[PDB]
Every structure is written in structure tokens, then in C-alpha cells.
């Protein structure tokens, strides 16, 4: 199966008019960091973590796939689909609340 999702040291930054969440996805194979956008509410508090139209769907694909299993992945399947994405980013969402 996949790795135990030990996402750690969940940061929060605001860098040149936008704002991101940084963390350490450390696994049994390797550790990376995943710059991900954050969507606040209309007041100023943490609301959501940019599930769709994200950054690590576009600019961090190979750096996310240098960690997980890319051996039993058929080549017609995009490597952000076989990589489990949803529960990783919901765990990032809940550990900023």
C-alpha cells in the first residue's frame, strides 16, 4: 500500500501578496515539502486549502512522485491520479485548525 502520511511541521506563510502552507511529507522512502495554496474565509481565518486548481497538481508533480510508488503505474495514467492526493491534503487541512 501507500505510506503512513506523517505530514509534519505544518507551516503557514504569506509570500508576495499570496499565501501558502508548507509542511514535510516524510515517508519511509523520502521527505519532501509541498507548497500549497490556502483559501481563507471572507473574514480572515483559515477556511480551506485549495483542493482543486492547486499548485502541487501543476508544479510539484515529479517532486511528489519521487517519493511514492511509480513502478506499478500504467503509462496512460497521470501520476497525480495514482498518487493518493485527497486524504493527504485533507490532513493538511485539518492540522491548521
Amino acid at each position: 500500500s501507500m505510506t503512513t502520511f506523517r505530514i509534519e511541521n505544518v507551516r503557514i506563510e504569506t509570500i508576495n501578496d499570496f499565501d501558502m502552507v508548507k509542511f514535510d511529507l516524510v515517508t519511509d522512502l523520502g521527505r519532501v515539502e509541498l507548497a500549497e495554496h490556502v483559501n481563507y474565509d471572507s473574514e480572515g481565518d483559515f477556511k480551506s486549502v485549495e483542493y482543486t486548481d492547486s499548485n502541487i497538481r501543476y508544479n510539484m508533480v515529479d517532486e511528489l512522485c519521487s517519493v511514492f510508488d511509480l513502478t506499478d503505474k500504467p503509462s496512460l495514467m497521470p501520476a497525480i491520479d495514482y498518487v493518493t492526493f485527497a486524504e493527504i491534503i485533507e490532513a493538511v487541512e485539518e492540522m491548521l485548525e
Partner: protein, 424 residues
Amino acid sequence: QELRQFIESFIQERLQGKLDKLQPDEDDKRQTLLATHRREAWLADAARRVGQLQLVTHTLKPIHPDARGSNLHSLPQAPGQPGLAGSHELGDRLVSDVVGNAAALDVFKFLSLQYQGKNLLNWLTEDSAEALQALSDNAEQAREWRQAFIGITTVKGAPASHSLAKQLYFPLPGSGYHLLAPLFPTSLVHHVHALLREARFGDAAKAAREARSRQESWPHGFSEYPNLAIQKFGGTKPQNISQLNNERRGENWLLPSLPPNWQRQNVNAPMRHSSVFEHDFGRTPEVSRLTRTLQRFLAKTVHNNLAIRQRRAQLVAQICDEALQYAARLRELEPGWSATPGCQLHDAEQLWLDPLRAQTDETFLQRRLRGDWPAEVGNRFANWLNRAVSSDSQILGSPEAAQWSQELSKELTMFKEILEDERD
């Protein structure tokens, strides 16, 4: 020049936007980042992870959702053509389309933020004494930071395109194919966006519209387009592709493309006095606009013959030919019509400004429409043009009115030659 400004501004940013929520727990990183980015070490801590992006001009990110390829960043070409122009006429070089990893807004701002006569990442590229001399730059770590910063324009390292990134063939004459892969000229898009932004608003066109309030306007030509088109990029987060964040919001727009009948018209033709007052002339909105142009700039002098003979003649005959084509395309909406009540236009437009009739009458009737030439209808159109529009009345012996009369006669003869075969 640069021996204080970027470092002091990095410390000012790290001090203003660094202690909004600053307890000792946040201070355990705030003191480290502030002591690093106050004077010196924040530049090296930023150039250490400053290698996710690569400043490429003719970008290829917005031409597909998530199709990572090779965003080529070279100059377009020599022009080589008589009547073409585009991204190979840039020159001013707004080539800062530096996009890549999204978490490099600090590296992008540090590269851009030295605009005192040059760039800030384009200023400290070669001859790094002018960027590490006033600030006391070292040798090893300073040279490593300078190489990792000014080597950001390097190649991605592959000639690779991508599957959904618009590769398309092009047939050579007499031989095989060169399948061409167009990319997205985002620096040309930025340049034309700046030009069309100052067309939209700003300081020039806003004050020009205010000067055309109060009716005292200056010699100044402002600009706005009808029928733009907004094409937005990125969805709900336009800084997944950089330079689509600040300088166009991810909200590119597209100026002209429309056909002559883009605003789609209709066809209506009655058989009464309300459809007989202009139903034998061809009065539509385009014909009214052409007549308004020829009535607002038609009773003037002819002392500028080089700008008058090719202008007023091409206006009159052009509006007459456009009205002929539009009346032909609009009068043929219904498939059935013949001699009936209210058909006084049918003595002039029964074959010219009217479609083909029904096919159940006697076969010995091909001479009433085959012979009905454009002498009554086209002559009536020429007489209506010469009765509504006119020429100079105090200069009625000059050459401008003679050229206008010859243009009106040629327009009537052309309308007759074009519409006289409504049965043949």
C-alpha cells in the same frame, strides 16, 4: 547603486510582514529570518531554493491545464515579410514571464526589485562587484549565490514538448511536413495588454474623456474597442502560472475578430406604405450609417483631391455596393412572392430587391423578370441617393461635385449590372 537597497528592503519586508502574530513561539523563527534577511544572509537563503523557475518569454503554461513541457524563452525571429508583425517586433522586451514553482515569489520579487536603470536579477548577472561590493560580498558563498541567482535563465534541459500542447502539421510545397508546435507569447500578450490597458483607462484616456466633458477638448487621440473578449487563466488561482498574477490578473483579453455580420441581423419586408416608403430603396441600419457618413463628410471641399477622390468615391460606391449586397441577402428571406397589393416597390424591386417567385404560373413569363433590368430599380436607387444626398451648391462648377456625380452614375450603373439579371 545596489550596495544597500535590496538588503535593507528585504529586512524592512521581513520586519513589517514578520511580527503580526509574534509571540516567542513565532519569534523562534522570526528572529532567525529577520537576522538573516536584514543585511546579508537572506539573499543566500533565498538563492539556495531559487531554482524552481526559469525566465522564459514565449511561455507554454497557459496553452493547456497541466501539460508540463518546454517553455522556450528565445527571441521570435527576423520579420522577413512585407505586411506581418508580432512577437518578433518586441524590442522593449517585457520578457519577465518568469514562472515555475509557485513558492518562489520571494525570488521573483528579488529578481525584479532593482529597477534603478537596469534589472535586479538582470542587473547583477555579470560583473558581480556592482552587487557584492557596497554590501561586502565574500568569495565562495557570494559566488555560489551569484551563480545560482544569475543562472536562472538557463535551459530546462530537454527539447520536450507535451501531448496536449498543440502540435500541428504544416504542408510544404512539393515535399513533406514540418509539424509546428505553437507556444503562448505571454510577453507579447503583456505588451499588448499594457497598450490596451492605457486604452481602457489610466491617466491619458480618462483625462481625455474628462476633456470631452466640458466641451473644451485637447489635441489628443484616445482609444477604446467595441467587442473585446475576456479569456481567463488558472481558474480560481492565477499564480500557478507566474506573471498571470500581477500584471494581467490571469485575465487576458482579445481585441477584434468579428465578421461583417457578427451582430446577427434579420430580414423583414412588408407590402404596405411603411414597407414602401423605403422598401424600393434598401434602407437598413448599415445603409443609414453609410448615408450619415456621406452626409456628415460629403458637402465639403475638393481641394484635397489626393485624399478626396479615393475617399468619397470609395465611400459612395462602397456604401452602394454594400447596400446592394445587404438588400440582396435580406430581401430573399421568404420563398414566395408575386404581383399583389402594395407591390409598388415590385415595379423597381420585383427582381432586384426581391427573391425568386413561385413556380406554378404559366411558362411564358420569363420575359417579365429576365428582361426587367436594373434601370427602374437601380435608376430609382440612384435618384433616391441624388435626392437625399447632394453636392456643393455654391461651388457647383468645381471638380468635387463632378467626381461625386460620376461616382453616383457609376454606382447606379453597377447596381443595374448587378441586379438586372433577377430572372436570367
